[PDB]
């Protein structure tokens, strides 16, 4: 539970973070499906309880760069990804930050609102300064 | 004024969790990047608008 795995329930093969559900199913059901008409929960068939199939985390990897003509220094964004997950992959860290956009690595969060330079999203921007 | 930005993993959509589908998608080459450019182009103008 709460781990990414290649499950098989009654032949329902897939990949997910299995989790304990607070849904309750009527006795004749084995599965649940979301709005999208896609499976999101399943019954443990030896010891009847409902499990949420959350998908294992994924996202776009966006690279933040000045010009090469300015510096070789770069910082990386993992879009939609909670920073706790990113060390699965720079996982040495030292400079890291979790935001509404995802996780930002190699850049320093500063309280001073400068004008936007490179747009990150969700009101964040990033830039190169002393 | 704007709309919801979206970004789509064309590989994960058509071949999520499969190398075997991946090696067949590899026959088609550029089309998933061409889609990703098209979507990314839209998403940038939602900041611009």
């Amino acid at each position: 539970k709460n781990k990414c795995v290649n499950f098989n329930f009654n032949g329902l093969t897939g990949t997910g973070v299995l989790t304990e559900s607070n849904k309750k199913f009527l006795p004749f059901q084995q599965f649940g499906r979301d709005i999208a008409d896609t499976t999101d929960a399943v019954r443990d068939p030896q010891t009847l309880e409902i499990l949420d199939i959350t998908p294992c985390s994924f996202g776009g990897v966006s690279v933040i760069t000045p010009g090469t003509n300015t510096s070789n220094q770069v910082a990386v964004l993992y879009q939609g990804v909670n920073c706790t997950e990113v060390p699965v992959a720079y996982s040495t860290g030292s400079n890291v930050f979790q935001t509404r956009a995802g996780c930002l690595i190699g850049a320093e969060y500063v309280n001073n609102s400068y004008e936007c330079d490179i747009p990150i999203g969700a009101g964040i921007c990033a830039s190169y300064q002393t | 004024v704007s709309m919801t930005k979206t970004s789509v993993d064309c590989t994960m959509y058509i071949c999520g969790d499969s190398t075997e589908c991946s090696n067949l998608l590899l026959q088609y080459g550029s089309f998933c990047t061409q889609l990703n450019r098209a979507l990314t182009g839209i998403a940038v103008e939602q900041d611009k608008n």
């Binding site: 999203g121 009101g123 | 970004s7 999520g16």
Partner: peptide, 25 residues
């Protein structure tokens, strides 16, 4: 007004928040 993920579908955030839009407004 009254208002996917696992197929690789992602709803990226706007650069301006609804709060920043309220500030400009």
């Amino acid at each position: 007004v009254t208002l996917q993920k696992f197929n690789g579908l992602t709803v990226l955030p706007p650069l301006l928040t609804d709060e920043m839009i309220a500030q400009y407004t």
